[PDB]
Each structure stands twice: as structure tokens, then as C-alpha cells.
Design a protein around this ligand. Structure first.
Ligand SMILES: N=C(N)c1ccsc1
Ligand SMILES: N=C(N)c1ccsc1
Length: 330
């Protein structure tokens, strides 16, 4: 089997991407944020505290003939930005882009934190990291990909995120028309539950490539590119007037700037992030200070190749017995 679904930016900045997902019988379509940095499929629901729902589409398990309470199971998760959600669990039929999994754990939110409530565009998350990170207790549950894998033509999914445009998540096949050149594959460590890999270095603009190992995660659920302070300082030093602002919470730059590109290494291959991808616009409406899309990972504890990086590539998440990651230009 295979699946193919379009993923769409939630706003003009590509702050996140949403992908329609069919849950239950008859189908209830919710727009979920596919997150290769977590492993829970959770949704706004008929169980979500009413005051914490503001415009999201909800899953109502009582209206699904295939929903079953997973008795005793609870979940609770926090994300890198301090947001969180928790609740109980149903199993139900879940389809993405024509690919169907029966008996998928659908984690129904009883509580969500304010930043979820305040974002009406995201109806939940669909985790695509390794199932060892799944938070369901006392019986840990498998991700949609883990459940689908044995049925897929090939045990892979691909992320092809657009810059200010829709893109595609495919399951079970590699669309050879969706990228240019060849795909370069690189080793993955699953020891922390992430798609963790080591970049071979970087360049800023037209500068020389610096060969240096940068361990990090391929994370579709993080907006920005978070890298070591040394790397980030070298990038922003090439932008007149750029500075790190403790009050704003990262590097800002004059909105009048033209940003340089940023290149990262994948083995001997190179992925170029155009400068425009690194512009996250005014820090507040009407401001002439703009927020940078490359930020320091110092304090996070891990480097994160988030959407800023991934959208510059066609990315293969290879879930074979020994997982790997592939990157191609596009
Ligand atoms: N859920 C994620 N994408 C995440 C959380 C901490 S670091 C990455
Ligand atoms: N609402 C949030 N803070 C969020 C959205 C996707 S991951 C976290």
C-alpha cells in the first residue's frame, strides 16, 4: 500500500504545516501537524475542556462506529516550546492520503495548553518519530507509520515541505519526480527516539564550506533551524545590524536586509537554504525588526533541523530495520 497527502502552511510565515487526516467511521477529517520529533497522535475532541477549544475541528469518538475506548490508557506530552496536552485514548481507523490503519491509537485531549487553544488551524498532532517516545501509559502505543509499515510497498515516508506553498507527505514510496539529482542517505541513531543524524558541516552565503560534525534531529514539527551558537553567530555576522535579543528571544535583523543563504552538509552532498527561507518577518506588527529563522540551540540540549532546513530538501525517512535519512535537492 501507499498514501499521499498534501501538507499546507498554516500561515504566511510557514509557522507549521497541516495535513488532512481521516479518523473514524464515517470519516471525521481533522487537520493535523505531522511531527517527526514526537510520537503521539492526539486530537482536539468532544472531551476537550470546552474553554480550551476555539475554532478547532474536534474528533467525537461517540459518532464513530469503529472507535473503542482503550480502557485505562492516558497520555500527557510537552513540546519544545513549553506547550502541552493530555487526555485518554481510543483506537479507531485512521487514513492519510488513502493509506488506512485500523486500530490506531487516537489520543483524545482532555486538556490543551493556551498556545494550542489560541491556534485555530491545528486540530492535533500526528507523531512520526520512533514509537519509543510515545507517552501512552501503561501500555505504550505505536505511531501511524509504525502501524502502517508492514503493509507499505517500502518502509519509508517522505517529507516535501513547501516554502510559502503546499507540499507533500508520501508513505510507502519515493516519488522520483519530486527531487533533482540524487538522494544522499546518512546514518540515523534511534537512541533518543528521534530521527537523529550528523550533518557534515555548513557554509554561509557564498562562503567556504566548514567541515564539522553537527548532530541533530530531522524535525518537521519545529519551525526553525536550531544550531550551535558558533554556527549561528557566523551566519548572523554576515547580516548588517543583526543581533541576539534576549528580550525578543533570539536573533533579529533589520527587515531591510537581504539574507544570505545557508548550506548544510549531508555526507558529501550539500543542501542550500535560500536566504528568504530564513526570514520570519516583523517581530510584532509594523516593526522594522525581523525574526531570524536560524537560532541557537544552546539551552535546548539538541540541534534541530526544523522546517527552515527541511523545506529546502526532499527528505526520506527510511524506516527499514536499520533506519536512515535521505536528502535531495528539489
Ligand atoms: N515534538 C518535537 N518536535 C520536539 C520536542 C522537543 S525537541 C522536538
Ligand atoms: N501550539 C503550539 N505551541 C504547537 C503547535 C505545534 S507543536 C506546538
Amino acid at each position: 500500500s501507499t498514501g499521499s497527502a498534501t501538507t499546507t502552511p498554516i500561515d504566511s510565515l510557514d509557522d507549521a504545516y497541516i495535513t488532512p487526516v481521516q479518523i473514524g467511521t464515517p470519516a471525521q477529517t481533522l487537520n493535523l501537524d505531522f511531527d517527526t520529533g514526537s510520537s503521539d497522535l492526539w486530537v482536539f475532541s468532544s472531551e476537550t475542556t470546552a474553554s480550551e477549544v476555539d475554532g478547532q475541528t474536534i474528533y467525537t469518538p461517540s459518532k464513530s462506529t469503529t472507535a473503542k475506548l482503550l480502557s485505562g490508557a492516558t497520555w500527557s506530552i510537552s513540546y519544545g516550546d513549553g506547550s502541552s496536552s493530555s487526555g485518554d485514548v481510543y483506537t479507531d481507523t485512521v487514513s492519510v492520503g488513502g493509506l488506512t490503519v485500523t486500530g490506531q491509537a487516537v489520543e483524545s485531549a482532555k486538556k490543551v495548553s493556551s498556545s494550542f487553544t489560541e491556534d485555530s488551524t491545528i486540530d492535533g498532532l500526528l507523531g512520526l518519530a520512533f514509537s519509543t517516545l510515545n507517552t501512552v501509559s501503561p501500555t505504550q502505543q505505536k505511531t501511524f507509520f509504525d502501524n502502517a509499515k508492514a503493509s507499505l510497498d517500502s518502509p519509508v515516508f517522505t517529507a516535501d515541505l513547501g516554502y510559502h506553498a503546499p507540499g507533500t507527505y508520501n508513505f510507502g514510496f519515493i516519488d522520483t519526480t519530486a527531487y533533482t539529482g540524487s538522494i544522499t542517505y546518512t546514518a540515523v541513531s534511534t537512541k533518543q527516539g528521534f530521527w537523529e543524524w550528523t550533518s557534515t558541516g555548513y557554509a554561509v552565503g557564498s562562503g567556504t564550506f566548514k567541515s564539522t560534525s553537527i548532530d541533530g534531529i530531522a524535525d518537521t514539527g519545529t519551525t526553525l533551524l536550531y544550531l550551535p551558537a558558533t554556527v549561528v553567530s557566523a551566519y548572523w555576522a554576515q547580516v548588517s545590524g543583526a543581533k541576539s535579543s534576549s528580550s525578543v528571544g533570539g536573533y533579529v535583523f533589520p527587515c531591510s536586509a537581504t539574507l544570505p543563504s545557508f548550506t548544510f552538509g549531508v555526507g558529501s552532498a550539500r543542501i542550500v537554504i535560500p536566504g528568504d527561507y530564513i526570514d520570519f518577518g516583523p517581530i510584532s506588527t509594523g516593526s522594522s525588526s525581523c525574526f531570524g529563522g536560524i537560532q541557537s540551540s544552546a539551552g535546548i540540549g539538541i540541534n534541530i533541523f526544523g522546517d527552515v532546513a527541511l523545506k529546502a530538501a526532499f527528505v526520506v525517512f527510511n524506516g527499514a530495520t536499520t533506519p536512515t535519512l535521505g536528502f535531495a535537492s528539489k
